[PDB]
């Protein structure tokens, strides 16, 4: 599940903003999030 629809800046804030934990970046910025 390397993928990234999002830019590394907005997953990392994604994942700063800790919205990995929502599905709007659980596929989005999965690679961020640490699906893959």
Same mark, same amino acid.
């Given at each position: 599940? /390397?993928?990234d629809?999002?830019?590394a800046a =907005? /997953? *990392?804030n994604? %994942?700063?903003n $800790? $919205? /990995?934990s *929502?599905? %709007?970046y659980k596929t989005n910025c999965?690679? =961020?999030c640490?699906? /893959?």
């Open positions: 599940a /390397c993928k629809n999002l830019p =907005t /997953c *990392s994604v %994942k700063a $800790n $919205n /990995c *929502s599905e %709007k999965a690679k =961020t640490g699906e /893959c």
